Design a protein around this ligand. Sequence first.
Ligand SMILES: CC1(C)CCN(Cc2ccc3nc(Cn4cc(-c5cc(Br)cc6n[nH]cc56)nn4)cn3c2)CC1
Lengths: 239, 202
Amino acid sequence: DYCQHFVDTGHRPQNFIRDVLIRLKDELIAKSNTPPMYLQADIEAFDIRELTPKFDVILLEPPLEEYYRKCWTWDDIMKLEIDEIAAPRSFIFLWCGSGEGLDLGRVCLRKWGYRRCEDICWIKTNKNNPTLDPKAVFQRTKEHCLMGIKGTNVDIDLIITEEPEIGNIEKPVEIFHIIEHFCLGRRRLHLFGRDSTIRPGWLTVGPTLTNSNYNAETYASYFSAPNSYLTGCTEEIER
Amino acid sequence: LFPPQWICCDIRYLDVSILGKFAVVMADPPWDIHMELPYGTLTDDEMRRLNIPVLQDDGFLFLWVTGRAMELGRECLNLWGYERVDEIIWVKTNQLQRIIRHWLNHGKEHCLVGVKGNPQGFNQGLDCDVIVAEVRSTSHKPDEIYGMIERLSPGTRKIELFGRPHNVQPNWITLGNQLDGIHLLDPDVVARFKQRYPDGII
Ligand SMILES: CC1(C)CCN(Cc2ccc3nc(Cn4cc(-c5cc(Br)cc6n[nH]cc56)nn4)cn3c2)CC1
């Protein structure tokens, strides 16, 4: 009993999980990926309809006050017009934290027109270090990333990593691996990304980016024929 | 600190008011998850209509959810007069402490935690919201949840809905339709049972 154990020692049960050829896919994903594109934009004060074309995949990482033991509330997040930039068949991965986000993020998913089809849990170990919202019953040692779909399996719905140092806000990069392994389409948007999250195959838009290279026309050009429908897991077509 | 008690019954039809008030309610319902399943399920409506609000004035509800029940269980939890304040996940392991393998293989089961009214003298924040434990059967929750609930609310009276025989525990009354008859020892409950059901016919 690791619950019992944790009560005696401060070693989280998840500390004890041991062992926490698909390189072929990883290579296709790598060859398929667009150049990284990125835009500094104050998302509050910015018409997201300027983000074209419509995305196959949106990774939405709004900075919750809860991450800090400008923050966005669920009030601010729920007013984003995500349904205006999402392709009719598309995916959303929303980082919802560990609190009221588990409810309000579901409302957001349904407001934008998605149904939740997975719940990915980021389980934080404290092996190098064996805090409480007033409503909490238990110590919170995990965060949820909700997967939503609108329209029409190498990986598991768990990511296990060590808790990051205090006021380090980053989500595990493994989330990108899980999303890329799904081969959903090459138009991938990360909202509230940072310099540190910029990645081939993604458009990163956020307030703290120090530089921009985004151009709607150049970005559209990567997905025009013959390339419109590529999954992200198949070779580019010859020329 | 009563020994195990239980009532084989159909929880849709039992008059649950005979049972009194509980510091902790736990439910592991066979939700209609819109897949063919070995076992019988309750419809969305029978789940919403369950007379959960009579079972507590102040305290916690533990609600096991899978699939579309992550959304339906949240509905039910709010319809019943609870706010969701925590969510436990059970990480399923084998004997070697390895995770047991849809867009995604499911490594975990979810238990929602609801609060009603003003719970006092609970030990909040003793345990964390992650359980790591072996799957010993299909369709069994892990026994560690009883420990976490005991440390949270020591020696209070608790009720489990849709519990199976292995789930009978001291300080708990277990309801479900796979239990073996009626075994009741709390004389308050015994008296209100005999009065409501003079012929023992639920
Ligand atoms: C940890 C988990 C993986 C464990 C299994 N979870 C689903 C689940 C599956 C099967 C199951 N059987 C029971 C027992 N059971 C079922 C009834 C019962 C069934 C009906 Br049709 C009408 C009833 N009226 N009154 C009691 C009734 N009573 N007891 C709980 N169950 C819960 C999901 C989470």
